[PDB]
Amino acid sequence: TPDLDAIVIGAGFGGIYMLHKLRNDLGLSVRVFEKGGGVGGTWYWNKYPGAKSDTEGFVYRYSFDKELLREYDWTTRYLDQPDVLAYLEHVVERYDLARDIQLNTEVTDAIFDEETELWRVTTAGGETLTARFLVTALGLLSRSNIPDIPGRDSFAGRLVHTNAWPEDLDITGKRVGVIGTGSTGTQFIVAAAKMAEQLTVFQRTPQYCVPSGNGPMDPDEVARIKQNFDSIWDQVRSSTVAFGFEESTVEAMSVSESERQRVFQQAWDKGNGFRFMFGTFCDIATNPEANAAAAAFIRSKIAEIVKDPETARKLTPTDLYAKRPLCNEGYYETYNRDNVSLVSLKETPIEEIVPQGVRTSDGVVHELDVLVFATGFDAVDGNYRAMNLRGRDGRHINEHWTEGPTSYLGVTKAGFPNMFMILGPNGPFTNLPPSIEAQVEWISDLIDKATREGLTTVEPTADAEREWTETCAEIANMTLFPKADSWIFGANIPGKRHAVMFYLGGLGNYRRQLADVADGGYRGFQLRG
Numbered sequence: 143t144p145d146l147d148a149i150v151i152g153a154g155f156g157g158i159y160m161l162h163k164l165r166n167d168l169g170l171s172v173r174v175f176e177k178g179g180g181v182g183g184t185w186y187w188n189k190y191p192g193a194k195s196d197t198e199g200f201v202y203r204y205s206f207d208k209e210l211l212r213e214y215d216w217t218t219r220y221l222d223q224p225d226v227l228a229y230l231e232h233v234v235e236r237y238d239l240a241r242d243i244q245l246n247t248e249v250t251d252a253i254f255d256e257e258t259e260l261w262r263v264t265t266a267g268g269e270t271l272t273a274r275f276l277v278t279a280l281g282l283l284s285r286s287n288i289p290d291i292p293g294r295d296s297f298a299g300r301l302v303h304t305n306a307w308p309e310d311l312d313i314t315g316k317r318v319g320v321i322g323t324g325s326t327g328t329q330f331i332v333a334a335a336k337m338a339e340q341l342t343v344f345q346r347t348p349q350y351c352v353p354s355g356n357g358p359m360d361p362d363e364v365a366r367i368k369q370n371f372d373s374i375w376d377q378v379r380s381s382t383v384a385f386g387f388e389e390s391t392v393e394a395m396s397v398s399e400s401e402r403q404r405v406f407q408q409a410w411d412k413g414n415g416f417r418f419m420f421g422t423f424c425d426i427a428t429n430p431e432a433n434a435a436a437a438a439f440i441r442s443k444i445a446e447i448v449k450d451p452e453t454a455r456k457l458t459p460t461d462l463y464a465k466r467p468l469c470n471e472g473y474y475e476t477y478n479r480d481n482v483s484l485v486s487l488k489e490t491p492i493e494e495i496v497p498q499g500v501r502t503s504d505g506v507v508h509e510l511d512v513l514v515f516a517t518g519f520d521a522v523d524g525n526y527r528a529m530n531l532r533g534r535d536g537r538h539i540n541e542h543w544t545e546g547p548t549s550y551l552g553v554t555k556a557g558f559p560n561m562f563m564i565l566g567p568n569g570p571f572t573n574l575p576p577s578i579e580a581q582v583e584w585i586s587d588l589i590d591k592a593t594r595e596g597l598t599t600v601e602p603t604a605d606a607e608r609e610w611t612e613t614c615a616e617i618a619n620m621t622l623f624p625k626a627d628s629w630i631f632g633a634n635i636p637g638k639r640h641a642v643m644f645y646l647g648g649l650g651n652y653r654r655q656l657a658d659v660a661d662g663g664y665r666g667f668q669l670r671g
C-alpha cells in the first residue's frame with residue numbers, strides 16, 4: 143500500500159492544477175515535488191528583464207474556475223513574468239495548495255516497481271517514497287540548454303542563462319552580451335537595451351518578428367472580456383492554436399497581391415506573432431508561396447525600420463517563416479539604439495570566451511561584464527531523459543526513445559503503467575494553459591476511474607503509442623514546420639535527435655481525440671484489475 147496515492151512532479155501551471163484536481167476534487171493523498179524554491183515553474187525561474195508571455199493576457203490563464211476568471215484583473219495586454227507568477231501564487235493560495243507542495247526538491251529517480259505495482263520516487267534530498275500514480279509536469283521548456291562554448295567558465299563577470307536569472311542581478315549601466323535570438327533573446331534584448339550601457343548581440347540565426355501590440359488595458363475592455371468569458375473559452379477550446387483569435391480560412395494565394403499586403407499590414411498593425419502566422423491566411427505554414435509572402439512582408443519592414451544597412455542585412459533571415467513565431471515591442475527598432483551592437487556568428491563565430499568578454503573569429507574581444515545565454519532548452523523530453531526514470535521492464539526512458547520521444551496522446555507512455563505526463567512528448571502546440579487543462583482533466587478522470595473501479599494498473603499498449611507516433615508524423619508532414627530548424631523538432635543540442643515531438647492538429651482536434659479515447663472506454667489501454 144503506497145505512501146501516497148499520487149506524486150506530482152512540478153509546480154508550474156501543470157502541477158498546480160494536477161494537484162488541485164487529485165487532492166481537492168478526487169480526495170486523494172498527494173504531494174508535489176518541485177525543485178525550485180518557489181512555485182510558478184517557468185514564471186518562477188525566468189526572472190530576466192523583458193520576460194513575458196506572448197499569449198494575450200486574457201487567455202494566458204486557467205479557465206476551469208469561473209469565479210477566478212471574473213475576479214482576476216490584468217492591466218496590460220500581455221503578462222510580464224512577475225504578473226504571471228503572482229497569478230499562479232494566488233491560485234495556490236486560493237486552493238490551499240502550498241501545504242502539499244514541497245519546494246527545493248528535485249526528483250532524481252522514478253522507478254516502477256513491478257512487485258508492488260507502485261512507483262518508487264527518490265529525491266536529491268534522499269527521500270524515497272511510493273505512490274500508485276505518478277504525474278510528471280516537468281515542463282516542455284524547462285531544462286536549460288547551456289552550450290559548451292570554449293572558455294565559457296573562464297568568464298570573469300556574471301554568466302547566466304535566462305532560465306536561471308538571479309534576482310540580485312541588475313544589468314543597469316553594465317556591458318551586457320547575449321547569445322541567442324529566439325523568443326527569449328529578442329524580448330531580453332528589447333528590455334535590456336533600455337538598461338545596459340552597451341548590449342552586444344551574438345546572433346547565430348536571425349528570426350522573423352512582428353509587433354506585439356502590447357499596451358495598457360482599459361477597464362471597459364476587461365469588463366467586456368469578462369462578460370463574454372464563457373464564449374471566449376469556447377472559441378479557444380475549439381480553435382487550432384488557442385490564442386483567443388479565430389484562425390483564417392483564406393488561402394493566401396487566392397487573393398490579389400494588394401489584398402496580401404493589406405491583410406499582412408493589418409495583422410502587423412494589430413500585433414501578435416501567432417495572429418500574424420494564423421489569423422492572416424490559413425496556409426502560411428503549409429503553402430510555400432504563402433510562407434514566402436509572409437516572410438518577404440517581414441523583410442520589407444526590417445529594411446524600413448533599421449537605419450544601418452549592415453545591421454538590417456544581418457537581421458534579415460532568408461529561411462522559412464516556420465519557427466515559433468515571435469513578437470516584441472519594437473525589436474528591430476531596438477537596433478537603431480546607439481548602445482546596441484549586433485554580431486553575426488555566421489561571419490564572426492565565437493572562438494573563445496575569455497575573462498573579460500568574447501573573442502570572435504575576427505580577433506575582436508567584445509569586452510563584457512555580463513554574459514547572458516538565451517540559448518533555450520532541452521525541450522520537451524529534457525527533464526525526462528535527465529531523470530533516472532525507468533518503466534515496468536527496468537529500462538531507462540532513454541531506451542524507449544532511441545528515435546525520438548514518444549507517448550500515447552501526449553499524456554501516457556507504453557511500458558510506464560500509472561504514469562501520466564502533462565505536456566509530454568507528442569501533445570498539442572498551442573497556448574498551453576488550456577492544453578494543460580485538457581490533459582489534467584483527462585488524467586484526473588482516468589485516475590478517478592481506476593480508483594472507483596479498483597484497477598491496479600492502467601497502461602497504453604505499444605501499438606497505441608506507435609499509432610500516435612504515426613499520427614503526429616503524418617500531421618507534421620502536411621506542414622512546413624519540419625523544414626524549420628529549431629528546438630520544436632529537437633537537434634538544437636548537438637547530439638539530440640531530430641524528431642517530431644508535438645501533435646500539430648491543434649487544440650480542438652486534440653480535445654476530440656482525448657474525449658474519443660475516454661468515451662470509447664480507453665481502447666489503447668490495458669486496464670488491469
Ligand SMILES: Cc1cc2nc3c(=O)[nH]c(=O)nc-3n(C[C@H](O)[C@H](O)[C@H](O)COP(=O)(O)OP(=O)(O)OC[C@H]3O[C@@H](n4cnc5c(N)ncnc54)[C@H](O)[C@@H]3O)c2cc1C
Binds near residue numbers: 183248
Ligand atoms: C520566457 C517564456 C515565455 C513563454 N511564453 C509563453 C506563451 O506566451 N504562451 C504559452 O502558451 N507558453 C509560453 N511559454 C511556455 C510555458 O512553459 C507554458 O506556458 C507553461 O508555463 C508551462 O507550465 P508547466 O507547468 O507545464 O511547465 P513549467 O512551468 O516549465 O514547470 C515545470 C516545473 O517542473 C520542475 N521540475 C522539472 N523537472 C523536475 C524534477 N526532476 N524534479 C522536481 N521538479 C522538477 C521545474 O523546475 C519547473 O518548475 C513560455 C515559456 C518561457 C520560458
Ligand SMILES: NC(=O)c1ccc[n+]([C@@H]2O[C@H](COP(=O)([O-])OP(=O)(O)OC[C@H]3O[C@@H](n4cnc5c(N)ncnc54)[C@H](OP(=O)(O)O)[C@@H]3O)[C@@H](O)[C@H]2O)c1
Binds near residue numbers: 326629
Ligand atoms: N515571448 C514569449 O512568449 C516567449 C519568450 C521566451 C520563450 N518562449 C517560448 O520558449 C521557446 C524557446 O525560446 P528561446 O528563445 O528561449 O530558445 P530558442 O528558440 O531555442 O532560441 C535559442 C537561441 O539561441 C541560439 N543558440 C543555440 N545554440 C547556440 C550556440 N551554440 N551558439 C550561438 N547561438 C546559439 C539559437 O540559434 P539557432 O536558431 O541558430 O539555433 C537561437 O537564436 C520559444 O520558442 C517559445 O516557445 C516564449
Ligand SMILES: CCCCCC(=O)O
Binds near residue numbers: 282466572574
Ligand atoms: C510548446 C510551446 C507552445 C506555444 C506557446 C509558446 O510558444 O510559448
